[PDB]
Amino acid sequence: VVGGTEAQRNSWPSQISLQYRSGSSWAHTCGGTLIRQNWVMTAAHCVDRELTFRVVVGEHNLNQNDGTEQYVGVQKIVVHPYWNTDDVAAGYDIALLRLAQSVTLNSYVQLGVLPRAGTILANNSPCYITGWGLTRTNGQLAQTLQQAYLPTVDYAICSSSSYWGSTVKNSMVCAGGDGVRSGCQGDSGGPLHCLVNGQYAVHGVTSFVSRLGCNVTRKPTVFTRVSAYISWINNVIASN
Ligand code: NA
């Protein structure tokens, strides 16, 4: 997250860190959203590589003992069948991870609330991106979970020529684009939390930024639109 602020420990309890084994340690690669006690929602592209993955819930600081973490293996990966790793602009950048154990819920560990199917936010709708991604373009991962206020940019504006053009689809949410704040590498797969009728819901799964940089004016961060995938989500969980 470029131009973020450190999140309070209990603001975003559905946020997880998806990590891969890296020698005798684990490295954060992507975000995710706890949606069942044994199911995480993430970006398909976060799991294109043939790695050993684990999920950390109740995680705040990647580099320090928070006293609140639970560490769980990924037992099953279900990627959207239409996902194509060479065509992220096509969409479908969503995957569900079934965890080897059911996590315990507390104030640091909660299910992410999802929008109703079909829900599209009005332009300029208030949202936060959260994650441990780079704090600057070509930068380093955050230690502490960050958040950045990223208002939505509607499909008509986001798919206009000075924004993302044909690259953005109606199956996606755009947010931000102010040249100051954004998603960056390592935020992928994590939530866009948007405030709708008094309640935050996870409307976005972080998918991509410009190749030119994370915080590039009129290249808002693009998210897979959760509300387009409600039946797919339910269908996967119900059969797994
Ligand atoms: Na920690």
- Contact at 8 Å (CB) between 31 and 131? yes
C-alpha torsion 91→206→225→158, nearest 10 = -80
Please tell me the distance between residue 133's alpha carbon and the centre of ligand 1 in angstroms: 15
Residue 34 in contact with residue 112, Cβ under 8 Å?
yes
Nearest residue to 153 (alpha-carbon basis) of 131, 127, 130: 127
One domain for residues 121 and 209: yes
Cβ atoms < 10 Å from Cβ of 27: 14
Q: Are residues 22 and 66 in the same domain?
A: yes
Residues 167 and 190 in one domain: yes
Cα distance between residue 182 and residue 129, in whole Å:
8
CATH of the domain at 92: 2.40.10.10
Rounded Cα–Cα distance for residues 136 and 133 (Å): 9
- Residue 196, CA distances (Å) to 8, 59, 155, 201 in order: 20, 26, 18, 7
Q: Within the chain, what is the greatest distance between any pair of CA atoms?
A: 48
Residue 45 annotated among the catalytic residues of the structure: yes
Residues lying with their CB under 5 A of ligand 1, a single-atom ion: 61, 66
- Do 223 and 131 belong together in one domain? yes
Do 221 and 104 sit in the same domain of this protein?
Answer: no
Q: What is the resolution of this structure in A?
A: 2.2
Q: Based on the domain organization, do 103 and 138 belong to the same domain? A: no
Structural domain range at position 125: 1-12+112-227
Identity of the amino acid at 37: Q
Q: Ligand 1 center to residue 59 CA distance, Å? A: 5
DSSP string for the chain: -BT-EEPPTTT-TTEEEEEEEETTEEEEEEEEEEEETTEEEE-GGGG-S---EEEEES-SBTTS--S--EEEEEEEEEE-TT--TT-GGG----EEEEESSPPPPBTTB-PPP-PPTT--PPTT--EEEEES-BSSTT--B-SB-EEEE--EE-HHHHTSTTTTGGG--TTEEEE--SSS-B--TT-TT-EEEEEETTEEEEEEEEEE-BTTBSSBTTB-EEEEEGGGSHHHHHHHHHT-
